[PDB]
Amino acid sequence: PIITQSVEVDLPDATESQAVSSNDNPPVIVEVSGIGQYTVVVEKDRLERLPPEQVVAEVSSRFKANPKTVFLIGGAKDVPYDEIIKALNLLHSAGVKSVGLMTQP
Amino acid sequence: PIITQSVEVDLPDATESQAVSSNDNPPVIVEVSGIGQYTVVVEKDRLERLPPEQVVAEVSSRFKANPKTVFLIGGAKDVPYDEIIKALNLLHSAGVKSVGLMTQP
Ligand code: NA
Ligand code: NA
Ligand code: NA
Ligand code: NA
Ligand code: NA
Ligand code: NA
């Protein structure tokens, strides 16, 4: 106590929906809720309860296979800010350069 | 019901602390807590309880005066994800291209 989190982001004019609609492949969705706990979803395939290092492995694998892959962070409206910063840092550590942020029911 | 929020972000290698430390001027901090309610802080000067359109006016004014200005979004660890997406969209609408995200006590 107390550790704070930070991340720098750039804001492009291109949109989250544009990224998804213009891509040949489904997006890879990193869903957050669970303190440092993630579900990775690609279409119907769900990889639940993954710890940070396993999310890095999964995401880095997909980015290497196709760097054009669209990555999204999904979560309920009330997911804590600190968890969102952690997730952005996690994705950047795995090599991801662009992310769509979206809230979900 | 139900409106969701989204924003696309790019992840540069440059950091939030780097942006602040390398700048000649203090950062402009948009603090969030309050549903669509913001405090804009520059050094000791606080502009509290600003509605979205007033934040846009204040931020756009500072960006026009100096486009090298460092903009930050500050908030407690538990600020809701949806409010963070709203704040990023608000800043981008005012012309801001880079933002540092940081949690605070
Ligand atoms: Na960063
Ligand atoms: Na793997
Ligand atoms: Na997280
Ligand atoms: Na966007
Ligand atoms: Na003004
Ligand atoms: Na907000």
Residue numbers in the entry:
A (entry chain A), B (entry chain A): 37 to 141
Which text from the study accompanies this structure?
Here, we present the 1.7-Å crystal structure of the intact periplasmic domain of E. coli TolR (TolR(36–142)). The final refined structure included residues 37–141, 161 solvent molecules, and 3 sodium ions. E. coli TolR(36–142) is also dimeric, but the architecture of the dimer is radically different from that of TolR(62–133) due to the intertwining of its N and C termini. TolR monomers are rotated ∼180° relative to each other as a result of this strand swapping, obliterating the putative PG-binding groove seen in TolR(62–133).
TolR is a 15-kDa inner membrane protein subunit of the Tol-Pal complex in Gram-negative bacteria, and its function is poorly understood. Tol-Pal is recruited to cell division sites where it is involved in maintaining the integrity of the outer membrane. TolQ, TolR, and TolA are IM proteins that are coupled to the pmf through a conserved proton-conducting path, which is also found in MotA/MotB, ExbB/ExbD, and AglR/AglS.
